[model samples]
Target: GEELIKEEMPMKVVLEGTVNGHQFKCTGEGEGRPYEGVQTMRIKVIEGGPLPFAFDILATSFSRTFVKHPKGIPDYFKQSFPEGFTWERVTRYEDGGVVTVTQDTSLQDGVLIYNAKVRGVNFPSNGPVMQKKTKGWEPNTEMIYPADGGLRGYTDMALKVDGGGHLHCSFVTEYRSKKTVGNIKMPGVYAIDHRLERIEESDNETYVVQREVAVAKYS
Candidate 1:
């Protein structure tokens, strides 16, 4: 039983761990709202085989999915990127920005969702692939590799949370609608989807990865 709980928070966390032969580290903080903070992530391949070459021969691809997230795109969301990324819809939509799964007759395309590959420098890379040592091995698709990133909206937090092996990072910006009524006002909601994916050759493997981040507190 607790009588008093602190407002918002000044949460500081640092995490690092290994899963499915990959090493992951992530960090994050929350001072005002649960979603109003910044977090960063890092993931890499560490497992190996008997041979000098790693047998896993990991290939990365930002494949498509059928799942649909409920959040709409943010106004400044496009500004978060230092070098911009590509994204598209994997599912369907409804009358407007209202996301839906089955509007078979209303198939459309906008900025609801999409895929993006990172640019060189500050981007994810298969060390071996880029090292020019992995003979007879190449990723199936040149899917943009996930790398580290920093996001901020202060009041807005963002994303979908699935898991993968490699420590790839991806996130989206979001903000809820401001509430207004006869005399009532409900604050909007903002969220950021700081995520991690593995960099191996496997599918359907969404395990949690460690996060190493430091979020500054402010109100």
Candidate 2:
């Protein structure tokens, strides 16, 4: 495969919710990956209060790694034990936080297990906190992509934290593979639907946040 060509594509990210009684709506547009290049994200509070903020977020430099099998490996074992496959990703935000995420995937019986670990400041939490979550879902081959381009599928993930404000998060993501950019193989774009609910034990308040994110690539 050829070295991936970098292009600037439009990216739209929306986050709306109340944070500790301060309602906010933030929308950002900038260059991203596969479709866009590196860019900054400026967020302005559209409602409630004047709690505005801005940060630099890079959605570019996307890549992926696949597991290889030796010759004569049976298809059954290869498909059943996908722990041989792993995906690593990096995300940087200007809030003095850099996040590295790794997903180790495998299949048992008919269910797909996606184990993900997130580390870094400003990625998941503000302080010294680490987030590790697991997801299980049945693989569906009949799902269709939003556009008339390719096939896609989705899974729902949920997690609850015992300490650190007793956070609860639910996520739904749609993904597909075999996408390409020129002669280089590209990780396919996906849609992220996230719902977060948490309590501030110190302040004795609760907050609910909703966010929608999508990565789109055009050939």
Candidate 3:
């Protein structure tokens, strides 16, 4: 067994790139495999595409470590989380309607891969909106590991936002970025290496991938 690195560390991901033909910049921070935190993303689209403006999102992020078990391997599925994490944001439109955006990602397959899903949700009144919240919807812009090292590369659909929504979609964008930094080697309980038991649960003679765990924020 290898020795685990037992210490609390700061984790942050700063990204500036293009998705669905637009440009965007976002940043997320929290504790490390060490998870949970907030993110701010702004999109500026200056070319011909969906929302012909700027879209800003304030969000909360978390790594998903639970999956389905087909062969009585629920324990294994629960323990192994190599599928990566998701950043979810929900925003309210002008019609008083709301939308949810789910950004999924992984960094162990040698590149940065992620996809964005925007959906419509019933509006939650008097909501903090983008404050204690985040949002996006209507189109799953697939950006699965499609970076120059960007996130993914897929066309996203556009929905109508009343003038307020239109007002919301009228921003500008464009700035390609790629593979800048990080130290996540393996996949599991700790996007990086750590001090813990071997998460080597097996469902079919194959070891599970990984699920990142984090230190409590009570240090």
Candidate 4:
């Protein structure tokens, strides 16, 4: 039987194409723990005209943390990152502009919590703004990774722009190990995949983006 356990400490995704006759590109990176971590994203227009083209350049930094879990678990949650595990991330996008923000942490007890927030925004604004802040809990089923094993997962997100545009995004990551380093087994290979799309309502046109990244640290 698979039993759930908790440990101590914790840690921490995009891209581009074209829209309505415009050309562009997108990319991003992730580092730190899975449940508690940070990531940065960037999108730029290479060809496609100016300010009001299809999609503007976007840059973002995100951080997440898990504070609570079931009783009889370790300090850091089981699904959390291992001490030296390296994490990789990828993101894809299409027509849209709705940003979704989520955060779940705990106080000191075994109580679990969860919270989510949504907002509308124009990418590549003058500066970054605080989007969401939450404190709540949900069942262990709501969590993504498993305790005491390799790491793998996927996420999907969609946002509708204010007036007449929409955006779609997807991300995935996988890590595995087949060798040992001292008393610990090292991750043999790691990879990430990201896909995205954007749509211009006026022209009924769409833009697509895709990215793949892989790393080999153990032999």
Candidate 1 lDDT, 1-219, residue by residue in tens: 001112232333233322223343333222222123222222222222122222212211121111111334222222222222223212111111111111001111211122222121221233432222332211111112222232222211111112312322222322211111212222233332322232333222121123222222111
Give Cα distance to truth, residue 42, candidate 1, Å: 20
Q: Please provide, for model 3 over 1-219, each residue's C-alpha lDDT reduced to its tens digit, 9 standing for 90 to 100.
A: 001211233333444434223344444333332222111122222222222222322121223221111232112111222444445454444435454455555444322344554444433333323222222323222212223322222223233233333212211111122212142222211111111112232332122222232221110
Sliding window of 10 residues with minimal summed lDDT for model 1: 98-107
Q: lDDT (0-100) at residue 134 of candidate 4?
A: 11
Whole-model alpha-carbon lDDT for candidate 1: 0.22
Off by over 4 Å in 3: 1-24, 33-57, 61-78, 85-97, 107-219
Name the 10 consecutive residues with the lowest summed lDDT in model 4.
132-141
Candidate 1: where is the Cα deviation over 4 Å?
A: 1-111, 115-117, 121-129, 132-195, 199-219
Best by lDDT: 3
TM-score, cand. 1: 0.18
lDDT for model 2? 0.28
TM-score of each: 0.18, 0.26, 0.26, 0.29
Report backbone clashes per prediction: 30, 5, 32, 33
**lDDT by residue for model 4 over 14-89, one digit each (tens)?**
2333322234333222222222212122223323324233232222112222223223332222233232222334
